[PDB]
Symmetry: D3
Subunit: 131 residues, 6 copies
């Protein structure tokens, strides 16, 4: 049967675990285990205002948990709205990589955002892992 994304349990150092939309449900148990193993993981959840979940849970499991709630405008096709989440996603990552330094970046979310986020990462020389 289907299982969570198989990931290696090592000390990579400082990890940026990203979860887009409901993708955060899956990164939760992963980020929790990396922190316990000795990794400084900071999670980022980018989704719509009415969809944040596990906020309380992973602020207590990682060194730092970031939530970027994008407003769900119901006057536009959903595509127009995802475009906003995609934007907020590049901006925050670009901002976190241009800010502090990371040892690894891991993400789980639509393959269209994984691509856009990969572009920002290959930009800074930080290794990545995609679901």
């Amino acid at each position: 049967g289907p299982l969570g994304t198989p990931v290696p349990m090592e000390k990579f150092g400082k990890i940026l675990a990203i979860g887009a939309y409901t993708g955060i449900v899956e990164v939760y148990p992963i980020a929790k285990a990396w922190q316990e193993i000795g990794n400084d993981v900071t999670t980022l959840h980018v989704t719509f205002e009415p969809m944040v979940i596990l906020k309380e849970e992973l602020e207590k499991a990682v060194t730092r948990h970031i939530v970027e709630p994008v407003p769900l405008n119901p006057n536009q096709d959903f595509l127009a709205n995802m475009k906003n989440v995609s934007q907020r996603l590049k901006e925050k990552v670009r901002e976190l990589l241009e800010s502090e330094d990371w040892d690894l970046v891991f993400m789980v979310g639509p393959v269209g955002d994984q691509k856009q986020v990969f572009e920002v990462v290959k930009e800074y020389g930080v290794p990545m892992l995609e679901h």
Copy 2:
């Protein structure tokens, strides 16, 4: 970099391509290509009312496209709401497998729904991608 789920381009016959939440964006190009290759693909999109997308696009690409919009109750933690989508998902699949017969089922969505949907599928003897 990251790419769409690599899938085989064959004639499996009748395919049920499922997309949960934004997972439908990815199944779209896949189901479109399977139809053109000679597969009778019917897509199912289970998500919240304010999140259906590509509806028009894949009704024109597949033999049949089904959308099950679950009401987003803003008076409950999001977990309580996903539970409704998970329910609507088992019910519709159970209903489609208990109804017509399929050659293959393929799904893209949270791993928690993929599990629940896999239980319904292993139940009927239909292979899952």
Copy 3:
């Protein structure tokens, strides 16, 4: 059981889908789907004169379908004959990459031709997909 080569359904742009010998049977459904998805795929079938297949089918499915029928000389061990197909294969690819520009090259055929064809591709900086 065994299934067709699992491939990603994206818009890479202009694709050169190659099929050596009976390998064309498998690339057919793949190239057909890539065209429909928005890719400018041109297929190349290199085989012996008495073995071309699906010619009609994939000329209608891709922007352009090329067939290079090599004469099957029955006065030589089959090895000596495959050598001619291997030659015709490097030449046509070298010619198509030195000619137009491609975004991706995908091939299905004996692993000995996949190697020789890979050498020509790494030569032009075009990404590839093997087995």
Copy 4:
């Protein structure tokens, strides 16, 4: 770049290494190494009369090498001819599994024959591999 099918080097016992068409070129070095490692490998090459290759080489490398040359009828589309090879392939395998007993079956050839051959194998409870 592309390499031969990665395979495990163990003693499975009696192995039936199958190579359809030019697929035999690849199974050759594989079957040769399995024999040397202590496996009783018998290879089967199913192809058209004008395409047998490596016959001498692998009769010397395996316990037994079988060649089934199917006549290439030039008065029919190649599809009609492959159908004959597909048939000869099911028949000989069915015949070899219904005859002696095997510990493993490994095959390299078009994915359409790998399927048909897999059906015959799942029939006898013998474990299998592909290309």
Copy 5:
């Protein structure tokens, strides 16, 4: 570069994480994380007396850590000695599966022991991860 065995982080329930010889070094961080995620993992380290490691560390990370130190007889080729570890490995597993019930078994060690241990597991209907 090479990394640890990629594994899924889920609640399978009760997990038997096995580490043969130095294989225990790798299962350590894995079993530690599974316990934290809500799994009742009990680790088993089968090796020679002069090779046990991380004993203290994983008794504190898992519900239960088992160590089976096999005596290293220096009067026999190493092959003859590994045979003893392979034996102690089948026996303890057979004993733990015939005893309590498990939801999953995961192992890291030579491929020759993974096979022998797999035979014992397929015997009881317990799923395995290599």
Copy 6:
């Protein structure tokens, strides 16, 4: 069921097949088959004095077999002792790559040594394969 590391059977040329601790048991059948296929494989077994195995067997199967027995100091936690094997491992590899030239390096041993050995290999531009 679990099987040996699936590996490709080709002529890479000169191969350095490394086996740490009991990892040598698995590389044995692999290195034996590579030699027979036309590869100049030299195996290296790094382990503790009381753990060398297959020495006789693979000196007869490869062009050259190297054994580096590290003394097992029983007055230190096993971790302190593995550190010595890890050291002897980098040194001998560094020494073999700085000495002769290789076409490929393949290793099977703890993932902590595979990493340390990979650093030495990426240093000389020699391609590698892990377990």
